[PDB]
Amino acid sequence: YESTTMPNQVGIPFKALIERPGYAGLPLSLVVIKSELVPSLVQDYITCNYKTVVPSPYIKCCGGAECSKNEADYKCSVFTGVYPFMWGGAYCFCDTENSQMSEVYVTRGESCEADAIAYQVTASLKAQVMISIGELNQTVDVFVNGDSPARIQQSKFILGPISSAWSPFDKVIVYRDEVYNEDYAPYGSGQAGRFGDIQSRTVNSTDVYANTNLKLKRPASGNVVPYTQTPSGFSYWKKEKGVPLNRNAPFGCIIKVNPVRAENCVYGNIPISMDIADAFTRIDESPSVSLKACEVQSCTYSSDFGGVASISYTSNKVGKCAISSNSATMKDSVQDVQESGALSLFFATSSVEPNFVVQVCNARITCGKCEPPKDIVPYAAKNDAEFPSISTTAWQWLATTSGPLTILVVAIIVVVVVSIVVCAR
């Protein structure tokens, strides 16, 4: 009826036949190009550079009062008795009792584009599985959250859920220069010593709670105002950034800035179930097969590339099987099996599972034969290897263990016979 389990390993082709036993000529081959973690996020806050503007002095003649102008953030000091010799910038009768209301306020800049936006993510899961029925070749982007029915030629497929070990998208900070992996503490901006120095709740909000330092002083000379002014808090963090969000998470996950998602993430197993029409008329042709052989060539060390085996056989009929299965990996899944069919074929599981039981229909054999030698005489035997595998020499060396055990049976007997005499009376 249904139901196989492929692991989530990308670019390796898996073959499923299932509806009921027997062979089909068109079977389902499916490959995963990539898993894709895509955000579903809450914007915690936005922070950005701000334009703090310090107006030059406004004077109020012969005794002022404090600021009762307001804005998004304001600081205000009232100096009294100012302009003691003046410069003719008094603009008053008074000079002995004038007041200067000095003022400063914050305004929010135009650098609030994404420089920087704090997100709490939990990711939603998206696949790019490539489906090949052997007559329509398409890949389709589709969500894997629970049950997901998809129909191609009115044969049912259900893409099941992927078991994610972890996702790279957490508390992260995004500048527009580059996604960056960096945690924050909530409501941590508007303060010094912690990330940010300005908090704005949404991008449209024209008012901000900002923290900046300014030192205003009174004039005391024939020139006109002393003040020292330090750069903005946000401007200090602009330089710092974070550390890149492009190499975080172990087990794949390449996070690329512009799609805002993480490609080629290998995690867990994907159950898949399908009801697919492969009857047709059964048999769908099953050639009986003879003279089954395994040639292994092209043996050169490495394992980050695929297997290269050649399988020789001879057949007594032409027909189509769906081979191979999962006990090995074929290039072709819709495959014409003919008389005298020697086939060099490509594999891709021969390093997760170096053993492979290659079938051509019903008939089958076991390979490989190429594995690192070390004895130093060549020795290669699968599926268990003694480290120098199963060989004469290994057996011979192992024979040590046997020695105490054999003598042990004799030892008991000699002890016993003497005891029988004592007991007898």
Next chain:
Amino acid sequence: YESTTMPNQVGIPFKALIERPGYAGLPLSLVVIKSELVPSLVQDYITCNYKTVVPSPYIKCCGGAECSKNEADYKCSVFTGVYPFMWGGAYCFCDTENSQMSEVYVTRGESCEADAIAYQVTASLKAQVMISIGELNQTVDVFVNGDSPARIQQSKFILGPISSAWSPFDKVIVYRDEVYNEDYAPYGSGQAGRFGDIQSRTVNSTDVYANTNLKLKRPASGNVVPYTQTPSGFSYWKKEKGVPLNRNAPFGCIIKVNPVRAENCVYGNIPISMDIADAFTRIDESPSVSLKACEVQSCTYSSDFGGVASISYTSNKVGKCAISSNSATMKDSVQDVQESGALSLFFATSSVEPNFVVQVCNARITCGKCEPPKDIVPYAAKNDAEFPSISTTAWQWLATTSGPLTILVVAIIVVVVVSIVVCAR
């Protein structure tokens, strides 16, 4: 300097005046008007009921054919046997091969009032504390998550981070009829049930992911569409409705649908900090006061009734004190304290706690001394008493302890003296 943990109880007057060493006036009285859970949600989908569309069946003479437009949600049935002879609407050359192509599809109309939005929430808790510096009476919306400094009326406040935070919200579907607590798994449509089967994310496009059922079957008569439809899981459930999240909520929380907040949620403790700096004259140059005593009027069983108590003391000098304590039931906190004797005042004892700690300036005591007997014992009092308190009944029970102690001292004697005889030799 600062810093207490108050419980969040609506309407309780909490008195903090912990400030630097030296007498520090102008106390903080703070009442909590409401806590306001301000949501921090991600929208999972938008769902509303739908407008089903038939574009009129298009009929084909001399052999039929199937549909060859398709839509996200579509149905196609080819009726056969339709019009067995030209019946008066056959519209056809052939009557042995008269077939009708029928098609139907659902679109979205957005046909709803505000029913319904599906959100994953965890809400953040924000307070609406009402704060009185004994100089002004004012309220402000301020976060109690994270450190949040603010200076209001020339006195510093920090509403600190939360001791613990909670919302009864989860996966919720907020109808305009009443918020209802419902579980669901998004992107899981496939079937005619499931809450929120219609999922729509583009509000600029008619696409919806849904699963629906439509029954269209070949009629044999010249009367032609059977048209019976068991609808979507959202629509099917819309008559049935969910159950309120508004009928139940541990620890306050009155949950309002349209603004999306939960008011007066007494969950957790709110840590508070103030540095008050307003002076006045510090020290406050207080009247010193002696003989503090408590009269307690009106005492029976547990009630929510207000306190009528009087304190007798003697005072010397006139000045302004900051009262009280850390826990008290007086409504005063700005009080001009003058020469006095018995001074009757109103309290909220048995409406904050049965214990009440009264201060007048530097001197304080803890009162009262009521607790009615219920065994029934003759005298019942608090607050370190055994609970029946020291009574005859208490004295007959204490006498337990007496029994072993007499016999043990007399037992030691008998044993130890007999041993001394034997030992002498």
